[PDB]
Design an enzyme around this catalytic site. Structure first.
Site, short mmCIF file in Angstrom:
data_model
loop_
_atom_site.label_atom_id
_atom_site.label_comp_id
_atom_site.label_asym_id
_atom_site.label_seq_id
_atom_site.Cartn_x
_atom_site.Cartn_y
_atom_site.Cartn_z
N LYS C 164 18.42 48.55 44.65
CA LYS C 164 17.45 49.62 44.77
C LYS C 164 16.55 49.39 45.97
O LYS C 164 16.16 48.26 46.24
CB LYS C 164 16.58 49.69 43.51
CG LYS C 164 15.61 50.87 43.51
CD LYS C 164 15.01 51.07 42.09
CE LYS C 164 13.76 50.19 41.89
NZ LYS C 164 13.28 50.17 40.45
N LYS C 166 13.29 51.58 48.53
CA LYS C 166 12.15 52.49 48.41
C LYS C 166 12.21 53.56 49.46
O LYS C 166 12.71 53.33 50.55
CB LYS C 166 10.85 51.74 48.62
CG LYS C 166 10.71 50.47 47.86
CD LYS C 166 10.45 50.78 46.44
CE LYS C 166 9.67 49.67 45.73
NZ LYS C 166 10.01 49.81 44.26
N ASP C 195 13.74 54.65 45.05
CA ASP C 195 12.46 54.74 44.34
C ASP C 195 11.42 55.35 45.29
O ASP C 195 11.11 54.77 46.34
CB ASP C 195 12.05 53.32 43.91
CG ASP C 195 10.78 53.27 43.10
OD1 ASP C 195 10.16 54.34 42.88
OD2 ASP C 195 10.40 52.15 42.68
N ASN C 197 8.30 55.92 44.39
CA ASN C 197 6.98 55.44 43.95
C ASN C 197 5.92 56.53 43.91
O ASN C 197 4.82 56.34 44.42
CB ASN C 197 6.52 54.29 44.84
CG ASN C 197 7.23 53.02 44.53
OD1 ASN C 197 8.12 52.60 45.28
ND2 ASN C 197 6.88 52.40 43.40
N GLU C 221 13.95 57.55 41.47
CA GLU C 221 12.94 56.98 40.58
C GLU C 221 11.51 57.45 40.97
O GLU C 221 11.14 57.49 42.15
CB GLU C 221 13.08 55.46 40.64
CG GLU C 221 12.09 54.67 39.81
CD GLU C 221 12.48 53.20 39.83
OE1 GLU C 221 13.69 52.92 39.75
OE2 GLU C 221 11.60 52.32 39.93
N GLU C 247 8.04 53.69 34.18
CA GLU C 247 7.49 52.33 34.32
C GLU C 247 5.98 52.39 34.25
O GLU C 247 5.32 51.36 34.11
CB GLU C 247 7.94 51.65 35.65
CG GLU C 247 7.22 52.21 36.89
CD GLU C 247 7.96 51.87 38.18
OE1 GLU C 247 9.16 52.16 38.23
OE2 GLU C 247 7.34 51.32 39.11
N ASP C 270 7.97 49.60 31.16
CA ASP C 270 7.50 48.29 31.56
C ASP C 270 6.93 47.67 30.29
O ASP C 270 6.09 48.29 29.60
CB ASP C 270 6.38 48.54 32.60
CG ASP C 270 5.86 47.30 33.25
OD1 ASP C 270 5.64 46.30 32.53
OD2 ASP C 270 5.64 47.34 34.50
N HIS C 297 11.51 47.89 33.59
CA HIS C 297 10.75 47.71 34.82
C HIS C 297 10.23 46.27 34.92
O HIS C 297 9.40 45.86 34.12
CB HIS C 297 9.52 48.65 34.88
CG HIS C 297 8.72 48.51 36.15
ND1 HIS C 297 7.38 48.21 36.16
CD2 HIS C 297 9.10 48.59 37.45
CE1 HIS C 297 6.94 48.16 37.41
NE2 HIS C 297 7.97 48.37 38.21
N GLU C 317 16.07 45.38 35.71
CA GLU C 317 15.58 45.28 37.08
C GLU C 317 15.24 43.83 37.45
O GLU C 317 14.41 43.19 36.81
CB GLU C 317 14.35 46.16 37.31
CG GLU C 317 13.79 46.03 38.73
CD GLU C 317 12.60 46.95 38.96
OE1 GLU C 317 11.89 47.23 37.99
OE2 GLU C 317 12.39 47.39 40.11
CA CA Z 1 9.50 51.62 40.53
#
Ligand code: CA
Ligand code: CA
Ligand code: CA
Ligand code: CA
Ligand code: CA
Ligand code: CA
Ligand code: CA
Ligand code: CA
Ligand code: NI
Ligand code: NI
Lengths: 359, 359, 359, 359
Positions: C164, C166, C195, C197, C221, C247, C270, C297, C317
């Protein structure tokens, strides 16, 4: 040019309360507060306070306010831009919870500072006017016998035409006996609100609400956990009494998801959790669109400045935790409250702060 | 002490336009404007203007503004309170249409006055800062061959990175020829928007949009009549290109119903129809809750003051009808527009007003 | 006879990171952690850790963990009952945010103590077995050229078949170039996840996802802010790529409301925010009912103990913040992670703790 | 060191019952049970039992338990993994019905063995504590005259505060006369539940329930056939009394579909049909998410171990079929039931089994 922030300090106090407020989860018998000062380079220091619920929150909240605040030194005093920056800063960690209270506290202090710099109350900066807002007197669990003198003084002397009490501490019979007593004592012309403080599940709320319907209640507040939006919506669907909620939802998005879920008939944002003045104004536009009457949760001094520019303004909640540490404590006249400036009208009685301060 | 209104006057002008703006329903080849002055008792006169669409609307609008304004003499300059009073005043007759434009025009002039009285741009009064907002250059029907010089100037000199043109005047082939030509001329790195000006029905809009999806358009604007919220929603549901609308909807409630119907992906309120600054701010809260990027429709001077405090701010539309009659015409720098104060930055070039006034 | 809690201590450390992890909102180049010890009266100390995101959160979190733990001293080591206790304690203040991370940290330590007392890994206490869970290697912004060696090592040394990275730091072209380069480098048989974010709004997420659809991504994500459930759902409806989120959601109710809104195709709670082991197990039942594949997460050590009893277990993860301060750091073999006991397999390397501790 | 299964045996018994339980479909006047033994290699034999409803199911259930058990020889005693294996084994044939009861019976015995191996009650393995759960006493059709003595003992001696009876055996007047009589005998402070045992169609259920509104019933149980989820939902939407159901639904997926359909206000899974302990835990997560109060259906011994870790735990049903063949029969104290261990607290009175065994 525009004022710049030069520093931020926060101090914790625990104020006394005459009326210990029992609720379904325990008792609040003192006022743990965090007092926030935002110094500027233009001879003004903005002020706001947070009600921290429990002593345990004080040290963390002070760290947060001061650590977030420190990074603001040198920044232009521009609440909308500062709010956007805090949003980005805490996007990953999360700004729900203590962080969001620090953020909202700071926002209120920025606006208070702007009001002070202009020599005007915040309400005038917002395009409105400082006028009397209908208020209600907010209590813990009441007993119509033991508390008659207090309630007499509220309605006769201070002019309150609305009283809120608490339930869910025991069984339905206990709630019903309390409400029946209150309605008998106060008569038909005083509004009565009941706050369950999240203590029931949806089925039990539906059951109790139906049995209280004959007492002409104005609203039932937080019948179930605040995070349970679907459960609120289920209670609302079956309830003949308006459902009130919101004092524990986070920022304008928290309100957008509650409204999307149809969680309640009324809302009452808390300035500490809705994102201060800036976040409140966003939610006021949401509530207008949804046709949801919008009241405030505590922080009556600051709430008085935003309710007059709230299209669906409903009630201001009077519960006075901070009067003991303010130079100019809240005044209720004829059951209503009027905003006081300059700024939010929050300036500390420093001798009292010294007395009640804790570290 | 707060300023009071002493009087209101309105004047009609028709400004010249360099380039005629052809649309699906006709041609706008001049700028019929109503210039609004709100005199106060504190040495300031608030200004705003309305684009009136057609000269037919000028006299009626002048009358309405003056008639309404006359009734506001002596009232405190408090925008939120004045808006509430105008709401009640026109509740039965209705404030959609010309009355609403008068009302919104007055609201803008009130805020302008507050800004002048504070010596600050309106954007700072609103808790924001005057900063560069992305802009696009708004044209009528374009022809890549015939209009190359104008578009080169727009992109190369003024730094525009987004261009809007018009469609629906003819058949789909015509729209596609135009867009294909524009995309070939401007290349992949300039945003292109297409405005149908309400000229299609939902089935035809759906058909044309699918055929245009290969040109990487940023949005399709008002594919069908503005009142047809259900039709917009049906187009939106089937469209692979974002649907933009809103320049013709009335007041915060008009937006609340459009959003409830899911009419569009983006919105672009017109300050003249949304309820001025006061109405815009309500709608900004709604757009944040709905996650709808919010742009402006014309009135770029005043729009620059509200976009900076709009959570979902998207684009400022640059179509300059008023430059000829302003002391400080709109400036575009690097394809962005920055708010100018004090107030809304609207003061009249009187010699030009005299030249273009119609009576 | 059941153990009792005798005390709780928390220590803050900032561990080094071999590689910085740039994300859309900033850079994580260190591991600020909170190490939690729960002493019992039966010769065992339970351990867990929190990843605190930012050093600013460390002091408040240490305060919260110790202050909550102080109030649990003397209670039976019964995680379900202790969680009910913590829920009631924070019902009014709110347990979203830092408080909820302290609560979940405590819950993990309680289960870790139970496992140690039994001489078993937590997974076996939960009726499962310690067996290899598919894992992915979790990076910041990657560049296929610059990071070829690292990725080769990840795939060849550790056997990862999924990576993964970002996006959302810049424009779409930047995201596309990154993903295009990675897919070209790694070939079609390595899973790729992207991701954002929380960096986009729904319209922009929809636009970028459609453009990335040809790269065969496993998931997208947190395309938009975590609180924006309706926004996630709008993205999910239009997306041809599965949407992953979770998460940052709080406790089982936070997941129930997200699932009710249809926010995502996949979820990845998470352990710090879902309510620890106890909260995770509740959500595992929700995800099974909703047919939502459920990943973790971070916190890979503890996550390895719950994924084997999660009906819809998907990925673990791997992002190793804590290895530096653990006696037995995480091991990845053939691209999978196996739970280590006894308890959660978390015991501190005290010399490293002393080195990295911050106060 | 994890125990392995060495063998499984099952025996059928028919236990005597004090008084017949008449229901809308017939009379249960005996207790046909299947007693299940899972031997391990660590000197422990796990135990559970099924209530088989009718003698006709005894031979097939014994066959199924023994045949499935034979294939588990040598397998590690890991309930989550064994359940997933049984799921795969019966995916094609189907595990609804007799197969599912054998599967759930096995799961319960596995958990009981684990508790015995740990020297702890199952509730403690599950992270909870053995504490009193509110119980109701479960009857067939009652007559307030003929059954007065039995009911007075129940409420006075055993301290039951809740009683359930059956309806639907005749017309509405019969149900009403029965409920009226019970309410008059028991007074206002004893809860009353009515079980139709699936005997009505939705329209007739709606008609009868409305007529029983004035008797303050706690719930209406299985008004219509258990497979008719849509029909249950229709009754629920019209009912002013909570609808209870679930004792006949199969596995966590059966609950997920019923909850998705909105079939009931309350649920009461049967450990024999929900997938034993393992499946119960999944459904507990679902009921928490849906805010559905969750009670048990019979098997009071084993139910007492899972209700304490069920977030929405409501009532434990007391109907004692197995007491005759248990070493330690169920005990009710002050109208509540507390889990007993070790394991599920199920060990056989072998002399009684011999007396009641059928082959
Ligand atoms: Ca994340
Ligand atoms: Ca409250
Ligand atoms: Ca209702
Ligand atoms: Ca247009
Ligand atoms: Ca669309
Ligand atoms: Ca999708
Ligand atoms: Ca039944
Ligand atoms: Ca109902
Ligand atoms: Ni400290
Ligand atoms: Ni046979």
């Amino acid at each position: 040019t525009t004022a710049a922030i030069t520093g931020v300090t926060a101090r914790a106090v625990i104020t006394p309360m005459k009326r210990p407020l029992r609720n379904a989860f325990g008792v609040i018998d003192s006022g743990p507060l965090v007092l926030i000062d935002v110094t500027t380079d233009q001879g003004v220091t903005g002020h706001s306070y947070l009600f921290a619920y429990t002593r345990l929150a004080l040290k963390p909240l002070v760290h947060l306010v001061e650590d977030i605040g420190r990074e603001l030194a040198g920044k232009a005093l521009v609440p909308v831009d500062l709010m956007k920056a805090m949003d980005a800063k805490f996007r990953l960690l999360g700004w729900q919870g203590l962080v969001g209270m620090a953020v909202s506290g700071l926002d209120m202090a920025f606006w208070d500072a702007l009001g002070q710099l202009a020599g005007k109350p915040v309400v005038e900066l917002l395009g409105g006017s400082a006028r009397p807002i209908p208020a209600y007197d907010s209590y813990g669990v009441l007993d119509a016998r033991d508390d008659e003198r207090t309630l007499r003084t509220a309605c006769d002397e201070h002019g309150f035409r609305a009283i809120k009490s608490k339930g869910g501490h025991g069984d339905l019979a206990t709630d019903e006996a309390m409400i029946k007593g209150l309605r008998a004592l106060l008569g038909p012309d005083i509004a009565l609100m009941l706050d369950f403080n999240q203590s029931l599940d949806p089925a039990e709320a539906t059951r109790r609400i139906a049995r209280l319907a004959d007492y002409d209640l104005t609203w039932i507040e937080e019948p179930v956990p605040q995070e349970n939006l679907s459960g609120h919506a289920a209670v609302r669907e079956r309830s003949e009494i308006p459902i009130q909620a919101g004092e524990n939802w986070w920022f304008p998005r928290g309100f957008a998801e509650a409204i999307a879920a149809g969680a309640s008939d009324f809302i009452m944002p808390d300035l500490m959790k809705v994102g201060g003045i800036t976040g409140w104004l966003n939610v006021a536009g949401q509530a207008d669109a949804a046709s949801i009457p919008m009241s405030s949760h505590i922080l009556p001094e600051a709430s008085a400045h935003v309710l007059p520019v709230t299209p669906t303004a409903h009630f201001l909640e009077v519960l006075d935790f901070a009067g003991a540490i303010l130079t100019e404590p809240l005044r209720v006249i004829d059951g209503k409250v009027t905003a006081k400036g300059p700024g939010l009208g929050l300036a500390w009685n420093e001798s009292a702060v010294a007395k009640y301060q804790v570290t």
